[PDB]
Amino acid sequence: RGSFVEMVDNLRGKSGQGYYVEMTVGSPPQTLNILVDTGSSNFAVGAAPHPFLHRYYQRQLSSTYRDLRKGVYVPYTQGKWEGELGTDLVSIPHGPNVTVRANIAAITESDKFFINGSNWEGILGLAYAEIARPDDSLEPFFDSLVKQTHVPNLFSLQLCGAGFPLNQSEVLASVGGSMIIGGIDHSLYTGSLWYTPIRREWYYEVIIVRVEINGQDLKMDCKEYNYDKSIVDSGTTNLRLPKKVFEAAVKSIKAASSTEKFPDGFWLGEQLVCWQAGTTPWNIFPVISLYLMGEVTNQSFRITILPQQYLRPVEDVATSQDDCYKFAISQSSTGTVMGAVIMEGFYVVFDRARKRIGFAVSACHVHDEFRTAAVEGPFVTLDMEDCGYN
Numbered sequence: 001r002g003s004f005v006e007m008v009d010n011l012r013g014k015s016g017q018g019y020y021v022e023m024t025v026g027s028p029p030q031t032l033n034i035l036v037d038t039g040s041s042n043f044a045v046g047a048a049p050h051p052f053l054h055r056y057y058q059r060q061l062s063s064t065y066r067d068l069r070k071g072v073y074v075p076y077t078q079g080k081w082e083g084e085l086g087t088d089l090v091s092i093p094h095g096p097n098v099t100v101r102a103n104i105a106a107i108t109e110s111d112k113f114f115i116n117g118s119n120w121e122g123i124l125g126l127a128y129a130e131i132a133r134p135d136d137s138l139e140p141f142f143d144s145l146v147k148q149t150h151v152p153n154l155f156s157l158q159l160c161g162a163g164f165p166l167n168q169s170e171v172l173a174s175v176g177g178s179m180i181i182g183g184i185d186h187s188l189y190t191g192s193l194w195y196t197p198i199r200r201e202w203y204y205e206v207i208i209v210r211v212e213i214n215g216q217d218l219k220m221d222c223k224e225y226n227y228d229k230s231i232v233d234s235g236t237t238n239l240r241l242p243k244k245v246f247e248a249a250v251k252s253i254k255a256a257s258s259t260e261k262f263p264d265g266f267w268l269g270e271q272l273v274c275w276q277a278g279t280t281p282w283n284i285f286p287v288i289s290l291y292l293m294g295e296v297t298n299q300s301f302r303i304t305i306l307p308q309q310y311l312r313p314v315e316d317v318a319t320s321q322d323d324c325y326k327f328a329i330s331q332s333s334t335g336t337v338m339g340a341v342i343m344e345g346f347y348v349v350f351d352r353a354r355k356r357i358g359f360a361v362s363a364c365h366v367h368d369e370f371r372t373a374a375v376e377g378p379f380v381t382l383d384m385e386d387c388g389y390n
């Protein structure tokens with residue numbers, strides 16, 4: 001049974017551009033599309049004209065707006081935003097039937113933040129206060145929602161990748177998945193949910209205990225997999241791996257697929273590869289399994305993704321009927337990031353109340369008739385806390 005019909009299919013967008021939910025801010029309500037980001041903790045919206053914004057938050061038009069008289073500056077690797085802190089009334093039209101007074105960063109300047117044609121105007125940081133800017137005293141949206149309402153302290157995400165390119169028109173008209181606020185919808189997954197502990201409440205931090213490529217153990221010291229952390233992050237496209245893990249994984253993926261040779265630019269994520277329509281050789285590419293620490297002592301489980309997850313469909317540079325893709329596994333110097341590449345395979349339950357993350361095979365994951373994504377267990381694994389980096 002699906003018990004959250006109101007919230008099923010409330011997401012739009014794709015990998016590379018981002019999955020967003022409709023929200024309203026202010027009185028009278030101002031509608032905005034908001035990127036869902038489990039990898040940050042600020043609620044921040046465009047609040048001034050920008051070339052890539054079709055609309056923005058107008059604080060002067062909101063009778064319920066409150067100025068906190070405080071600036072916020074958020075530099076990150078590939079860009080930045082800055083703005084002014086305030087509070088206002090916020091609702092999610094395809095969400096729980098509640099209105100909350102939440103912190104809002106009104107973005108007045110940004111660099112490489114807004115994406116042309118993504119159709120979103122702001123970001124919903126769903127992680128914990130520890131990583132909020134300017135500091136942990138700025139209560140994140142979800143904490144406000146839970147404190148002010150009877151909504152259970154849990155949300156779940158089904159991100160639905162298309163498996164083929166969507167153009168401007170198609171992304172608008174299409175369903176990109178579900179964010180179920182306050183519950184778990186049984187219609188969004190098949191098989192069992194398996195839970196991994198949230199190691200610490202800042203990012204959604206987890207512990208990977210083993211990595212396999214087509215069943216072959218990558219055979220690295222498990223600390224390497226979590227150096228300097230492993231996180232579940234809907235605001236990142238790629239599966240991102242620590243440098244040494246990336247090198248080892250790519251060598252193994254190349255060996256598994258060695259019946260075809262791909263240029264270095266492909267493996268670096270820089271260059272697309274194209275096949276004649278319908279002929280993508282999925283079967284030459286390996287499955288990838290991540291083993292996660294279980295809830296029971298000395299137990300683990302595994303999640304397994306297909307090339308249909310880690311090869312990202314792209315529109316051809318020279319318009320044709322070819323099926324074209326980029327490699328969406330990449331190097332990290334900030335630990336493992338389980339981005340949309342992982343998340344598109346799975347229904348992911350962010351069980352904040354019980355400090356755990358649940359995984360189940362997504363009812364919308366892309367596959368062929370020969371192989372599917374999997375969530376399987378249990379496995380007997382030892383010394384797993386040792387896999388955590390300090």
Ligand SMILES: COc1cnc(C(=O)Nc2ccc(F)c([C@]34CN(c5ncc(F)cn5)C[C@H]3CSC(N)=N4)c2)cn1
Pocket residue numbers: 014015016017018019035037038039040041042074075076113115131132133233234235236237340
């Ligand atoms: C499913 O495919 C996807 C998913 N997401 C996107 C996308 O455009 N994400 C996005 C855009 C801007 C942005 F700033 C971010 C951030 C906000 N960050 C942040 N915010 C506050 C802070 F204190 C520290 N870092 C870091 C930064 C890069 S990684 C992340 N998780 N979130 C994500 C595209 N395709």
